[PDB]
Amino acid sequence: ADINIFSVASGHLYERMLNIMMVSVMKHTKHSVKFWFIEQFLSPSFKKFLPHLAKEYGFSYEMVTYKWPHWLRGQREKQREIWGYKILFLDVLFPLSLDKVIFVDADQIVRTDMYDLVQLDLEGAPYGFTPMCDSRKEMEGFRFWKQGYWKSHLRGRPYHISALYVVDLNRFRALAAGDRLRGQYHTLSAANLDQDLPNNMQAMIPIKSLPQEWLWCETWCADEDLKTARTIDLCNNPLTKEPKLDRARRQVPEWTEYDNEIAELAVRVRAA
Ligand SMILES: O=c1ccn([C@@H]2O[C@H](COP(=O)(O)OP(=O)(O)O[C@H]3O[C@H](CO)[C@@H](O)[C@H](O)[C@H]3O)[C@@H](O)[C@H]2O)c(=O)[nH]1
Ligand SMILES: [Ca+2]
């Protein structure tokens, strides 16, 4: 397919949002799209509905059955296991026939043609991530990456949010980035695994910083930049603690539209 998107998450609300993420992608492209999931992290109900969603919205999909290898230290906590599946297996989840894959968070709403991200020049980097926004200045106290360990360690590189990333799998494989990430994981495994690990290894495994418009989250990013945002992440706000759905329905007018459309499809599938 032209566009290849990977997502992984757990839970009922995240499955509901995952369907909305997929629909949002299809509403903004005419290029072909394949979604890649990890079989064990989708509920039976989700897996039964998926072929119906695919036929309605004109995408293909694959459920991968890759299991955490015995030689790699596991994670007892589900959230951390899922973070491992996001970042530790990019060279092994996907076949060598695949040139590129994009991780999109299940809570995202896309407002752009994702083929633009496929075509974006990564300047030799094995992957590209969006920097955390500086624009909402009133949240500076929560920008942990601008002080202490991160300020000195980054030596002027951005700290990037892990909600969205494009992986040039040819470059990633050539650099043995998967081995390098797993190697650092083993050393460090003796906080936010999916985000801290790639941000920590930029000197060895570089990140191309995507233009800021690629990922807007209200927590970090100014109101004025919503109108130009290509994708929205519903990232949590440590100040307000505003609930996830309230953020979704408040921030994103089309969220309800997509949710309703999918629900109506489910009603018809069940009626038949
Ligand atoms: O019901 C849930 C709740 C969370 N998660 C996952 O748990 C992590 C934390 O997510 P969440 O509590 O919703 O916070 P967010 O603020 O949306 O997460 C932001 O920060 C995380 C790193 O801390 C990144 O993984 C996300 O991409 C980024 O959007 C993420 O991997 C989620 O996908 C689930 O799978 N199911
Ligand atoms: Ca998110």
Author numbering: 1190 to 1379, 1385 to 1466
Article passage:
We determined the crystal structure at a 1.40-Å resolution of the C-terminal catalytic domain (CAT, residues 1190–1480) in complex with a UDP-glucose donor substrate and Ca2+, which are required for the enzymatic activity. This was confirmed by the present crystal structure showing a GT-A fold comprising nine β-strands and 12 α-helices.
Our results reveal that UGGT has a modular structure in which the 35-kDa catalytic domain is tethered to the 125-kDa folding-sensor region.
